[PDB]
Amino acid sequence: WSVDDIVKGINSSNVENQLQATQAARKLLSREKQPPIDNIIRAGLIPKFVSFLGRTDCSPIQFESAWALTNIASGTSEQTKAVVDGGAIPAFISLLASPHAHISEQAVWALGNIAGDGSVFRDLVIKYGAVDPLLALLAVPDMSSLACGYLRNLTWTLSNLCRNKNPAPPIDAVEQILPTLVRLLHHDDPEVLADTCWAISYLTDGPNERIGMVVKTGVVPQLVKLLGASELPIVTPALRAIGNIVTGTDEQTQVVIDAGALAVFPSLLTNPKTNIQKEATWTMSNITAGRQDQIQQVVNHGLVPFLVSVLSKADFKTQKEAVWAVTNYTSGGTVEQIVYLVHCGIIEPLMNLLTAKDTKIILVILDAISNIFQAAEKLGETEKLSIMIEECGGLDKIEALQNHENESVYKASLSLIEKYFS
């Protein structure tokens, strides 16, 4: 078929010719080669597809037009906008209640593609009342009766409904969707668990009120369980949601610490995947930025040596998160805890990073060493620390920063040299 032929057929009076033309359009759109979505949009065929979506009499045309509109909305934002402007969102929401599962799930697919474009189309889909039907589909007493493919499609559409920011997902949709996500987190299918963890991650990435909403449901233990799964597609979003949660209040970080999350961090910090390592080190950093008892929990789990090792022998992107962990640890820790950090061998690997080209990280490192010097002052072992720093090559590297890398670093490095090394 050609675009002109399908245009003539879709506008024909025969319902059979209309169905044939819609089939040809769907086949052009589902043909793996670069679809001609732009041409089909310029043909004025989207309104005809939207009208077909309402033909309860003809299930084939409903399915074919929904498929074609799904494939059209899977492209650029302009094409998704063409679908949305054609009034496709209400039509798909109406189809959600279709007696045919294939059309209902094709509508779920299309609504997912639309809500994935951005936050505006997501808020529109929520505005036209798609949340409750979509969630009704999953509510079936036995979620196993709902085929794993259909359940995955529904979970993915819901994840897109919890995705994106500015504006953040509306409260009316989140208060509806969270319990279903709690239910789905207890399924045995990996592809559903990954999407559910990703949705929770989206929801926990923002104000502490949303983190508190997610926490008050009691799912943090199940997220910690998934944290130690063998499947990296599931571990990535779970580690990520936990890292987001630990960016909130001390009660929330204590919810995470109580769920036994720290027990998994020896494996995450020693993980081959560099992104897992970096995100776990960032989580450790935000945990060492908490109460003294939380830092003591980090120490009790024996994670300080692991941090020393990621600071000493890792990539720079993870070494920076290790530096942040060290700085927060020294900023909020007891004198005993800082003595422990030093006795674990943090001085040399921390100062061996002053040779980098990041003014920010250099200033943070210098703040850390200043905190350690303050602890020494409280202990009466300032000169011992000066000697140790000098012998580890520390004084040399702090002096090298007097080359006005930045006036900030110059004055910071000058302050230390005069206070303790002059």
Binding site: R31, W109, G116, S159, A289, G332
Partner: peptide, 25 residues
Amino acid sequence: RRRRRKRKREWDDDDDPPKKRRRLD
């Protein structure tokens, strides 16, 4: 010494799910 603030994340897209999907055959 005073406790430091918690650093909110920086979003990454290393293995994010697909924002849009296409049905094919």
